[PDB]
Amino acid sequence: SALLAGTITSGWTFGAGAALQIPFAMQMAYRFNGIGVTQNVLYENQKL
Amino acid sequence: TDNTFVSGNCDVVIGIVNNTVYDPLQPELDSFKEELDKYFKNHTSP
Amino acid sequence: TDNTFVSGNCDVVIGIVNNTVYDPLQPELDSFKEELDKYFKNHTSP
Ligand SMILES: *[C@@H]1O[C@H](CO)[C@@H](O[C@@H]2O[C@H](CO)[C@@H](O[C@H]3O[C@H](CO)[C@@H](O)[C@H](O[C@H]4O[C@H](CO)[C@@H](O)[C@H](O)[C@@H]4O)[C@@H]3O)[C@H](O)[C@H]2NC(C)=O)[C@H](O)[C@H]1NC(C)=O
Ligand SMILES: *[C@@H]1O[C@H](CO)[C@@H](O[C@@H]2O[C@H](CO)[C@@H](O[C@H]3O[C@H](CO)[C@@H](O)[C@H](O[C@H]4O[C@H](CO)[C@@H](O)[C@H](O)[C@@H]4O)[C@@H]3O)[C@H](O)[C@H]2NC(C)=O)[C@H](O)[C@H]1NC(C)=O
Ligand SMILES: *[C@@H]1O[C@H](CO)[C@@H](O)[C@H](O)[C@H]1NC(C)=O
Ligand SMILES: *[C@@H]1O[C@H](CO)[C@@H](O)[C@H](O)[C@H]1NC(C)=O
Ligand SMILES: *[C@@H]1O[C@H](CO)[C@@H](O)[C@H](O)[C@H]1NC(C)=O
Ligand SMILES: *[C@@H]1O[C@H](CO)[C@@H](O)[C@H](O)[C@H]1NC(C)=O
């Protein structure tokens, strides 16, 4: 529960240090950048 | 405009907010416009 | 010119094609030239 709760509320920050909150759509936008897809591709398709 | 990039319009992005985005080229042309203005001003005088 | 960077010329790259590259600064100065032109035209009038 702690690992899963930290993931959805803080992304990878809680592993690197103190758990810094971040909106999940904002977090998923950082993840899209991680795979080489521009973050606007998330926001423009967030519902899908 | 250098820190950011543009895609689409405001209707699609859930949670978008309103704030000005600085175009650094604008004042670099505005002072150019004022330089142009004063050149014209002086040119009327003689 | 913002989407692309430049290196060398058209003789070395195998498979290079011909296509225009938009420079967004050009029209931003072109309408500045038209603004300038009408200023001069109006200055001839009086
Ligand atoms: C970010 O900026 C956007 C653009 O500035 C804002 O969109 C604008 O939102 C306003 C308010 O909703 C809207 O105003 C008109 O909305 C109706 C047309 O869509 C029109 O009928 C309205 O006129 C009526 O209402 C006013 C009072 O609200 C009365 O005084 C009038 O007499 C009349 O009864 C009003 O004129 C703009 O049209 C709209 N512009 C665009 C381009 O969408 C965003 O709201 C803003 N977002 C945030 C979070 O600040
Ligand atoms: C991408 O664009 C490049 C530049 O726009 C093109 O390069 C140009 O290609 C043309 C045609 O191949 C070439 O034209 C002249 O080529 C000779 C000098 O190199 C010259 O002798 C030619 O004149 C003779 O030939 C013509 C018919 O070809 C006759 O009508 C004439 O009367 C005369 O006999 C011709 O004027 C350019 O020199 C060349 N420019 C450069 C900078 O290389 C690319 O071909 C083009 N590539 C693609 C895939 O579109
Ligand atoms: C955040 O949630 C509140 C409700 O708790 C809502 O009123 C608000 O519009 C939301 N803002 C964004 C950007 O999603
Ligand atoms: C204004 O015009 C005069 C010529 O009458 C010139 O000597 C002077 O340098 C000009 N100044 C400016 C700011 O254009
Ligand atoms: C690609 O192959 C075609 C024939 O299959 C050939 O005509 C063409 O020059 C080739 N282009 C490149 C860039 O190798
Ligand atoms: C042109 O000059 C007149 C004065 O003769 C002025 O009233 C008008 O605003 C000027 N227009 C422009 C576009 O410069």
Short mmCIF file of C-alpha atoms in Angstrom, two decimals, chain A:
data_model
loop_
_atom_site.label_atom_id
_atom_site.label_comp_id
_atom_site.label_asym_id
_atom_site.label_seq_id
_atom_site.Cartn_x
_atom_site.Cartn_y
_atom_site.Cartn_z
CA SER A 1 0.00 0.00 0.00
CA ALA A 2 2.81 2.42 0.83
CA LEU A 3 4.64 1.75 -2.43
CA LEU A 4 1.44 2.04 -4.46
CA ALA A 5 0.21 5.10 -2.56
CA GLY A 6 3.52 6.90 -3.03
CA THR A 7 3.57 6.09 -6.74
CA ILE A 8 0.19 7.60 -7.56
CA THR A 9 0.64 10.66 -5.32
CA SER A 10 4.36 11.40 -5.74
CA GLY A 11 5.69 9.59 -8.81
CA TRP A 12 9.31 8.49 -8.56
CA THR A 13 10.28 11.27 -6.15
CA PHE A 14 9.49 9.22 -3.03
CA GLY A 15 12.18 6.75 -4.10
CA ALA A 16 14.86 9.35 -4.78
CA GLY A 17 14.16 11.26 -1.56
CA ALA A 18 11.22 12.91 0.18
CA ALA A 19 7.86 12.21 -1.46
CA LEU A 20 7.02 15.36 -3.43
CA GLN A 21 3.35 15.48 -4.43
CA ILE A 22 2.47 16.04 -8.07
CA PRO A 23 -0.87 15.86 -9.94
CA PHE A 24 -1.20 12.47 -11.56
CA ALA A 25 -1.95 13.92 -14.98
CA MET A 26 1.16 16.02 -14.46
CA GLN A 27 3.02 12.89 -13.39
CA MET A 28 1.81 10.91 -16.40
CA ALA A 29 2.95 13.82 -18.56
CA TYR A 30 6.47 13.38 -17.21
CA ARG A 31 6.21 9.66 -17.99
CA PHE A 32 5.23 10.37 -21.60
CA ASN A 33 8.33 12.55 -21.94
CA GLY A 34 10.26 9.56 -20.62
CA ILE A 35 9.20 7.44 -23.60
CA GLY A 36 9.82 10.15 -26.20
CA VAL A 37 6.21 11.24 -26.67
CA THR A 38 5.60 14.94 -26.08
CA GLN A 39 3.57 15.69 -22.97
CA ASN A 40 0.85 17.52 -24.89
CA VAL A 41 -0.07 14.12 -26.37
CA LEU A 42 -1.30 13.16 -22.89
CA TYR A 43 -3.27 16.32 -22.15
CA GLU A 44 -4.86 16.39 -25.60
CA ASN A 45 -5.94 12.76 -25.04
CA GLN A 46 -6.30 12.53 -21.24
CA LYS A 47 -9.85 11.17 -21.30
CA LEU A 48 -8.84 8.39 -23.69
#
